[PDB]
Amino acid sequence: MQNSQDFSITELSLPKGGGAITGMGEALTPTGPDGMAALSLPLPISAGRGYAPAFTLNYNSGAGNSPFGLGWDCNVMTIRRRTHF
């Protein structure tokens, strides 16, 4: 629609049920130049007010160990000292 925006809240309409079964997905990633296998899984985090933390469990081959098991990561943003050298 011309002369219309998508930031408009117009309905309180109820959702419909049935349809295809979804449940949980698997973000098996089509990685490129790194050649690594990777998979992301979502967490059941409610949007709440529309601002909510973003989390996923990331599987990354060769990542190392973790609180979520070998090869998995918590995906928490941090600042860290560089230990590389």
Partner: protein, 1228 residues
């Protein structure tokens, strides 16, 4: 010949934003010496694939800016401020060697350098607010609250699209009234003026003490604002309000933050129940209809516990106080442990299996853990049985939807099961139907093709196989199964009778080859410039292993779409022959696009060649658009030139038609929602715009809520009368509607504001219809305008399963005793109240009719028995009637079939059939039926049809050697337009346009009879007999509703001793026919119409006065319609024949006989479900059709027809096609 394009960033900001960008569409290479094409293509294809529009270099230049609110404490980057988009066009010769790149473009003399032809396309600006002011801020706040968006709609040059037709001052004033404002360019150049813009998407924001939520919103400043009432935590909107005072609200399920209990603007509640994890489980709704509460019981009254197990959920009883109850079984794919297997493992082995994670904590078998134990030779054999004696079903869900409400004694439950894969795509769906034959599902999911009678039948449909990319590769045709459980795929594939198609995809994901159940296939070839599309006839030669049209006719006759370098279709070439061994011609439709990519013009190939010869010839169509693509003007050689202006809300304010009638629309003001209040118009001849329509809208009072009318149009005053809405259902449909028509001498000019006056414009015969609906919304009871009641019943699947009619003052008549439907839901069997059984046969591989049989079971007498033979596409090549000839045939028992021949464009070339030996010449004048006592015979005939390069039928050659009928119909076709008439009006093509008005409406029907079109393009009056200034003209005239329905037809004869007036009023479910002689009523007949015309409609003739002495009252007329809805066989209440009629392909009558003349006089629906008028003209909704010509009486409005010839009758294939209301909807 590759296509090529390039996006170049010319400049960017310090924060990486694209300040300047260029999109380059490179021109096509010229013709190469070597083509490198597969040469499976028709000849003269590549030559006709090149066009000047493909050789253009298109440089779309976009300039923009942003705001960056940066400081030591704030960092908001990339907030849009503005953009401008210009386009340059250069020739192929201007492409630099090596193509374009940034270094060349940055050059001071580059193609996008200044002092170059920058054609403006448009610009936008974002206005920011602070939630306090209304005035746009110079810079945004940290919050980036957007006030509104500014879009340029008109350049000054685009106002030339008005083609004058408005004063210069009137136009600037009108644009301001419409909300357009004049402003400057955001990225101005030296040398330009202001442009017109629209402001939209307005938001008023709340504050920082709240979350900065929008509080009020509107599309434009010309309308009101909706108010968002936020909850305590500003998380969800709880209540909404609007300008009319109409509000809605909802309660939320705080576990999910989703609405569950909703209040409509009417006193109508909707409630859903959610489970853990948030899936809808149940739905109820309740509230009022007519001052009292009905619907489903609220949950505190009607307790309900949704079922768990899917089979348990199917085997339910009627009184379930719920709609759409869901049962989910996503777990069904997993193997589970039965109690026998577990109880054996329950001693020691289950523990090892449990620790191995084979046996889950919920007693299921883990897929991978099980496989690991099989691989490691640890698996316990007892578990093998759980993978085989209980085949898994794909994850699925069951819907249980009732027809009626909680208190109703009958509540059928529609049982719908859907299955899906693990990618979330449906595999199939099935629904419960009534008992009958069905395929069997074996214990292992194997499909048994051998059908058996059963109580439990599901119609399996949409069964689809996929390739793990979501590209369905196989569709199975629908069928009935004696189960609901999913049928195994490996089994179905080997049945073969379990018919299915095949979709072959390329690496892009496009379908290349589609093979149907019959082995016939479509094939598409793609090249960078054109797409070649072959149908099943085009490919027929390759699927040989001659009962149809010799496939040589369609060899190398693909449809080819030729594109420009912007991806737009500029040419559409058809190839064609009329003979199998001919040399196909090249019929090319041409299109051109403007700088915005909108279709600017289109040219018919007949007119194209004429146009090259004579450059004064116009394109068939020309369009002019505003900068956002809204057509402002359209001109059609077959429909005239119109100009339209809409306001900033998108609603039309002003339009002028081809004939110069200017129509304007009065809408509500900004304190109101902005709904239409009135339509007024004036012709060039008058000064005052007359109000032809007036809408009284409902508000938000209790009386309105009580009848579910809040916010509805409740009184619609239009051109024929006034329609009143008295009540709506809880489901949103009409329960009560009534109307009055205008006095014959009264024009619609609903002036003033006092309905007292408006009532005096009306006749006092007020018609009221009433309805009852179920919870779903199916019509259960329909009371017509005079009190006759139609009662309907539906089956477990929701389809009609019977029908009855109670006449006013009488007992209930059964109209339909029984109905059966195919898996596809097609009518399969029908048993009528007159003990006539209609049976349909469908080709199961194509799911289309292959025959129709009509019989009387009491004497096993077949009255009709048709067979339809089709070519590989679906054109009917033969229609055969294997029934015995009827009693109206004087010693003639055998009826040869109807042979059809089509050209490669599927136009008829020829057709054969039977006709009355004495039918004579086809004209607008219809012959009297033969009576069986006449001892008449029928003959065979053939017609041949000749068409021009524009698809106009130019000649029809009728031949019937038995009586030596030799009738040549000559059609004179305009040499400037596709307007055409018979040679009896004019022979000179240059005089043809003179016979049509500015809008393309024919002025003369037949020579001597004039046509009065009104301002809406509707036919107001037909002169039948032109007389002197003493005697009056015989004429017929009409009144139409606001949506263009013929509401009233008046047949006025002026014969001095026979000045009969037939007043025919069209009411829902009733044709009311009042016939008066020059002094008084001779007949007063109510024709009750049960069912749709063209769908074996049953009519009842009820007389209140003047019933013929040879007709009983309450006479029933059962129509048996053909493939496209034409009425061929008419039976009485005992199934005896009343009449028989055949038609020429275009609707002319070929054959007609009846039991009596009196009975014959009441048959009104004749062709393709439509009424044949007195003039021979057929009425189709928005159009009238001339069957003696094979053309429409008036052109379609531009834009409603996909092809270019606006007078063409149903693609020149009236054998298989029909066009409801005369305006075949766009495929778009």
């Amino acid at each position: 010949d590759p296509q090529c394009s390039q996006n170049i960033t010319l400049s960017s900001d310090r924060f990486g934003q694209p300040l300047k960008q260029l999109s380059v569409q490179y021109p096509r290479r010229q013709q190469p010496a070597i083509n490198l094409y597969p040469d499976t293509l028709p000849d003269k294809l590549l030559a006709n694939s090149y066009d000047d529009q493909q050789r253009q270099l298109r440089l779309t230049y976009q300039q923009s800016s942003w705001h960056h609110l940066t400081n030591n404490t704030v960092r908001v980057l990339g907030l849009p401020d503005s953009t401008r988009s210009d386009i340059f066009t250069y020739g192929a010769e201007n492409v630099p060697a090596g193509g374009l790149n940034l270094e060349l473009l940055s050059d001071k003399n580059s193609l996008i350098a200044d002092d170059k032809p920058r054609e403006y396309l448009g610009q936008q600006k974002t206005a920011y607010t602070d939630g306090q002011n209304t005035t746009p801020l110079q810079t945004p706040t940290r919050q980036a609250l957007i006030a509104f968006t500014e879009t340029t709609v008109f350049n000054q040059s685009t106002l030339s699209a008005f083609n004058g037709s408005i004063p210069s001052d009137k136009l600037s004033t009108t644009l301001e009234q419409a909300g357009y404002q004049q402003t400057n360019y955001l990225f101005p150049r030296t040398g330009e003026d202001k442009v017109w813009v629209a402001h939209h998407g307005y938001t008023d924001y709340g504050t920082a003490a709240q979350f900065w939520r929008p509080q009020k919103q509107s599309n434009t400043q010309l309308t009101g604002k909706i108010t968002l009432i936020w909850d305590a935590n500003y998380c969800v909107v709880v209540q909404t309000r609007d300008a009319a005072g109409l509000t809605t609200s909802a309660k939320y399920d705080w576990r999910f933050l989703t609405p569950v209990q909703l209040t409509d603007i009417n006193d109508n509640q909707h409630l859903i129940t959610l489970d853990a994890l948030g899936r809808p489980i149940t739905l109820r709704f309740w509230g009022t209809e007519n001052g009292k509460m009905t619907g489903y019981s609220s949950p505190e009254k009607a307790s309900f516990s949704p079922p768990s197990d899917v089979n348990a959920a199917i085997e339910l009883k009627k009184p379930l106080p719920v709609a759409q109850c869901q049962v989910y079984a996503p777990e069904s794919w997993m193997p589970v442990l039965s109690q026998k297997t577990f109880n054996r493992l329950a001693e020691q082995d289950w523990q090892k299996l449990y620790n191995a994670r084979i046996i889950t904590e919920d007693g299921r078998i883990c897929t991978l853990a099980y496989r690991r134990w099989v691989q490691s030779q640890k698996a316990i054999p007892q578990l093998i049985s759980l993978l085989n004696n209980g085949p898994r079903l794909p994850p699925h869900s069951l819907t249980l939807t009732t027809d009626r409400y909680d208190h109703d004694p009958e509540q059928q439950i529609r049982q719908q099961v859907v299955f899906s894969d693990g990618f979330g795509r449906l595999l199939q769906a099935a629904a419960r139907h009534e008992a009958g034959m069905a395929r069997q599902r074996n214990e292992d999911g194997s499909l048994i093709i051998n059908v058996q009678h059963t109580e439990n039948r599901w119609a399996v449909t949409g069964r689809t196989e996929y390739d793990n990319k979501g590209q369905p590769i196989r569709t199975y045709q629908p069928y009935f199964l004696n189960d609901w459980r999913y049928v195994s795929n490996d089994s179905a594939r080997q049945e073969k009778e379990a018919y299915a198609d095949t979709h072959v995809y390329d690496p892009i994901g496009r379908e290349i080859k589609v093979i149907t159940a019959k082995g016939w296939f479509r094939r598409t070839l793609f090249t960078p410039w054109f797409t070649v599309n072959e149908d099943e006839n085009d490919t027929a030669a390759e699927v040989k292993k001659m009962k149809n049209i010799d496939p040589k006719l369609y060899q190398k006759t693909p449809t080819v779409s030729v594109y420009d370098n912007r991806g737009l279709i500029i040419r559409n070439i058809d190839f064609h022959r009329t003979t199998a061994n001919g040399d196909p011609d090249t019929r090319i439709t041409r299109h051109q696009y403007d700088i915005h990519g909108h279709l600017n013009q289109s040219i018919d190939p007949r007119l194209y060649e004429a146009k090259q010869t004579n450059n004064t010839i116009k394109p068939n169509f020309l369009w002019q658009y505003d900068l956002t693509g809204n057509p402002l003007c359209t001109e059609s050689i077959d429909a005239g030139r119109t100009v339209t202006l809409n306001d900033i809300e998108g609603r039309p304010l002003l339009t002028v038609t081809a004939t110069g009638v200017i129509q304007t629309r009065q809408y509500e003001t900004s304190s109101l929602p902005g709904r239409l209040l009135s339509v007024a118009e004036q012709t060039p001849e008058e000064k005052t715009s007359r109000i032809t329509e007036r809408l009284i809208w409902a508000g938000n009072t209790e009386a309105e809520k009580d009848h579910n009318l809040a916010g509805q149009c409740v009184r619609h005053y239009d051109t024929a009368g006034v329609t009143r809405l008295e009540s709506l259902s809880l489901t949103g449909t009409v329960l009560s509607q009534s109307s009055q028509l205008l006095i014959d001498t009264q024009e619609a000019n609903w002036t003033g504001d006092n309905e007292t006056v408006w009532q005096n414009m009306l006749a006092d015969d007020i018609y009221t219809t009433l309805s009852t609906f179920d919870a779903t919304g199916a019509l259960l009871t329909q009371t017509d305008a005079k009190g006759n009641i139609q009662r309907l019943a539906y089956d477990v699947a929701g389809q009609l399963n019977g029908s009855w009619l109670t006449l006013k003052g009488q007992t209930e008549q059964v109209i339909i005793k029984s109905l059966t439907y195919s898996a596809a839901g097609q009518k399969l069997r029908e048993e009528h109240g007159n003990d006539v059984i209609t049976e349909y046969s469908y080709e199961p591989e194509t799911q289309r009719l292959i025959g129709i049989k009509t019989r009387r079971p009491s004497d096993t007498k077949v009255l009709q028995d048709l067979r339809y033979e089709y070519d590989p596409v679906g054109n009917v090549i033969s229609i055969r009637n294997d029934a015995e000839a009827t009693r109206f045939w004087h010693n003639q028992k055998v009826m040869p079939e109807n042979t059809y021949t089509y050209d490669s464009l599927y136009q008829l070339i020829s057709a054969t059939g039977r006709e009355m030996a004495n039918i004579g010449q086809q004209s607008h004048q219809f012959p009297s039926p033969a009576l069986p006592s006449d001892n008449n015979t029928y003959t065979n005939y053939t017609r041949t049809y000749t068409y021009d390069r524009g698809g106009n039928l130019t000649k029809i050659q009728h031949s019937s050697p038995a009586t030596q009928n030799n009738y040549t119909t000559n059609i004179t076709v305009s040499n400037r337009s596709n307007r055409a008439v018979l040679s009896t009006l004019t022979e000179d093509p240059a005089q043809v346009d003179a016979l049509f008005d500015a809008g393309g409406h024919q002025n003369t029907l037949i020579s001597g009879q004039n046509l009065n079109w009104n301002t809406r393009g509707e036919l107001q009056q037909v002169t039948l007999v032109k007389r002197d200034k003493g005697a009056n003209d015989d004429r017929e005239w009409y009144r139409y509703s606001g949506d263009g329905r013929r509401m009233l037809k008046i047949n006025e004869q002026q014969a001095s001793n026979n000045a009969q007036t037939q007043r025919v009023t069209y009411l829902p479910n009733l044709e009311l026919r009042l016939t008066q002689n020059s002094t008084a009523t001779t007949e007063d007949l109510q024709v009750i119409t049960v069912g749709e015309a063209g769908r074996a409609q049953v009519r009842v003739l009820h007389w209140e006065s003047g019933k013929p002495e040879d007709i009983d009252n309450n006479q029933l007329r059962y129509s048996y319609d053909n493939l496209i809805g034409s009425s061929q066989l008419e039976l009485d209440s005992e199934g005896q024949i009343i009449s028989e009629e055949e038609y020429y392909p275009y609707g002319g009558t070929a054959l007609w006989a009846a039991r009596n003349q009196t009975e014959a006089s009441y048959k009104t629906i004749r062709y393709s479900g439509k009424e044949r008028d007195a003039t021979g003209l057929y009425y189709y909704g928005y159009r009238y059709y001339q069957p003696w010509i094979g053309r429409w009486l008036s052109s379609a409005p531009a834009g409603t027809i996909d092809g270019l010839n606006l007078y063409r009758m149903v693609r020149n294939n009236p054998v298989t096609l029909l066009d409801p209301d005369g305006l075949m909807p766009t495929i778009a």
